[PDB]
């Protein structure tokens, strides 16, 4: 359980205070009004520490605030307004537990997006990049102390960052059709945001016919869901799936029974009926429900590796706004998004995100004696004790346990594959088997530095830790409160320009290669082919190089877990 040190709690609060005052010194006196389909909005011109400038519109509503009876329901469109709406400050984040301070924060009034561009009257209609933040569908925000546009606005693009409901408030699911809480409200928020963007980005200089959706972690799962569902057919034109996709095990769960589990932890003393449970939850104070989300999972769900109590789900009945009518495994076979250019990737040591989990409870290391608990659920029996499942675990232990005694690095390496690399492989192959989908480009983020970091490093106790962890690449695409100005010839600065260059180039043309990017001149970067038995990727380190994916040999061993049930792979 991610407990951040008290020494680090003080440091973070100091940095955020300094950051508030930097932001004062970066804001100009210049403002701008733009149109939206609901009314005018006013934005403010801001500087970056590199002395570029950009127009900044935050807190643009794309839905009605989901208060009162609208709680747990699919989003509804907002009420139009006259006059100019002030969008010079951020709005609240979705209700959550702050991953640093451990206190509940945020507000139910969180359905907002931010729009940023260096020029409101450009000489072209620019590619629109839409970022969906990660955080397990339970934490995160679009605040600029985490997701600053300062690097992207160096290019002639439009960056849009969105919020969506998190946790139980975004993902309650009830079987009773009469209650109209089918689930995935948080993904339906993203759908309504994407429709707003198609319909309004032109008012900020963007190209409605050239929109790129990208996200990291649960945000990449979200971006993939947005490429899978029929609700969004045709709404955008490129996807970038960073360190996560919709067939990741942690990104979906049948959580319809957990509504009663969370209500009873909050004091509900009624029977287990959907109508009675919902009535209680509609009256509950929002921060009470979200603080207890931690303890909703059962033991049996924990050992089965269910990460979150509430999150995306297969909806139990059809509604007009339904996002997931079938399992994502099946939706991939006819997804409209298979026909748009796609880039995916991971970092070179994804599993580093779990370092305090295995430091806190070293009893976790015993799980690598048999590896029974990492056998995927569809291949395992109920109690994970049948000899076939132990034979599968030995295959997992062969792949990751280096010596005769399991170590912490072994555990983390296994996490990289179980949570990220293997579901990527499975996604790519099920596309080839069932679709005419367009070839996909692979990158591998492998630039390690601590000169500049991002707040997710605090969460994983990454201070002093070598290796390129899950979410370390965000440092090189987004400004954040821990960042600083860097010398132009430094390795960190060149990595920023390379990452922003590749992401922007892919958004522009659907092809992430350009010889005009420093380090790519004599390089040829091909997408993946059906017949490829070993994946090639762009390994982004101090040098840019096309290499066989180093994870490929371990990926092939995870696939061998399915050779007696190839229909489930």
TrEMBL record:
The modification N6,N6-dimethyllysine is found at residues 154-155, 484, 564. The modification Phosphoserine is found at residue 217. The keyword Glycoprotein applies. Its EC number is 3.1.1.-. The modification N6-methyllysine is found at residue 554. InterPro entries: AB_hydrolase_fold, CarbesteraseB, Carboxylesterase_B_AS. It comes from the Eukaryota. Keywords: Disulfide bond, Glycoprotein, Hydrolase, Serine esterase. One of its GO terms (molecular function) is carboxylic ester hydrolase activity. It is an enzyme of class 3 (hydrolase). Residues 32-545 form the Carboxylesterase type B domain. Belongs to the type-B carboxylesterase/lipase family. This is Carboxylic ester hydrolase. It comes from Cochliomyia hominivorax (Primary screw-worm). The gene is ChaE7.
């Amino acid at each position: 359980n991610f407990k951040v040190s008290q020494v680090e709690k003080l440091k973070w609060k100091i940095k955020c205070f300094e950051n508030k005052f930097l932001n004062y010194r970066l804001s100009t006196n210049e403002t701008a009004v733009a149109e939206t389909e609901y009314g005018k909005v006013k934005g403010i011109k801001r500087l970056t520490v590199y002395d570029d400038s950009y127009y900044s519109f935050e807190g643009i509503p794309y839905a009605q605030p989901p208060l009162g009876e609208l709680r747990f329901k699919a989003p509804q469109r907002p009420t139009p307004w006259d006059g100019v709406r002030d969008c010079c400050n951020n709005k609240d984040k979705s209700v959550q537990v702050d991953f640093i301070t451990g206190k509940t924060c945020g507000s139910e009034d969180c359905l907002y997006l931010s729009v940023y561009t260096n020029n409101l009257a450009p000489e072209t209609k620019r590619p629109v990049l839409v970022y969906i933040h990660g955080g397990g569908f339970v934490i995160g925000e679009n605040h600029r102390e985490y997701y600053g546009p300062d690097y992207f606005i160096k290019k002639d693009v439009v960056l849009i960052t969105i919020q969506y409901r998190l946790g139980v408030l975004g993902f309650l699911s009830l079987n009773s059709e009469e209650l109209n809480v089918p689930g995935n409200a948080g993904l339906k928020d993203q759908v309504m945001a994407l429709r707003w963007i198609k319909n309004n980005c032109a008012n900020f200089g963007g190209n409605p016919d050239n929109i790129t959706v990208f996200g990291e972690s649960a945000g990449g799962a979200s971006a993939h869901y947005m490429m899978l569902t029929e609700q969004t057919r045709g709404l955008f034109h490129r996807g970038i799936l960073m360190s996560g996709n919709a067939v990741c095990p942690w990104a979906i769960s049948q959580n319809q029974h957990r509504a009663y589990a969370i209500a009873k932890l909050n004091g509900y003393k009624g029977e287990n009926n959907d109508k009675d449970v919902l009535e209680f939850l509609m009256k509950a104070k929002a921060h009470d429900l979200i603080k207890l989300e931690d303890k909703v999972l059962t033991p049996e769900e924990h050992v089965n590796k269910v990460m979150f109590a509430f999150g995306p789900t297969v909806e139990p009945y059809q509604t007009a706004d339904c996002v997931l009518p079938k399992h994502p495994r099946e939706m991939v076979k006819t997804a409209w998004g298979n026909s748009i250019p796609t880039m995916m990737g991971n970092t070179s040591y994804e599993g580093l995100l779990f370092t305090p989990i295995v430091k806190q409870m070293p009893a976790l290391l015993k799980e690598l004696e048999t590896c029974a608990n990492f056998v995927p659920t569809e291949l395992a029996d109920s109690e994970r004790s049948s000899a076939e499942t132990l034979e599968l675990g030995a295959k997992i232990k062969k792949a990751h346990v280096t010596g005769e005694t399991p170590t912490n690095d072994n555990f983390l390496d296994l996490c990289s594959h179980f949570y990220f690399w293997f579901p990527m492989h499975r996604l790519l192959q099920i596309r080839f088997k069932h679709t005419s989908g367009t070839p996909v480009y692979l990158y591998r983020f492998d630039f390690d530095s601590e000169e500049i970091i991002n707040p997710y490093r605090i969460m994983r106790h990454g201070r002093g830790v070598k290796g390129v962890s899950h979410a370390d690449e965000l440092t090189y695409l987004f400004w954040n409160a821990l960042a600083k100005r860097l010398p132009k010839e430094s390795r960190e600065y060149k990595t920023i320009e390379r990452m922003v260059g590749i992401w922007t180039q892919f958004a522009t043309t659907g092809n992430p290669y350009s010889n005009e990017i420093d380090g790519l001149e004599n390089i040829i970067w091909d997408p993946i082919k059906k017949s490829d038995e070993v994946y090639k990727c762009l390994n982004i380190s101090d040098e840019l190089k096309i290499i066989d994916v180093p994870e490929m040999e371990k990926i092939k061993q995870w696939e061998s877990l399915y050779e007696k049930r190839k229909d489930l792979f």
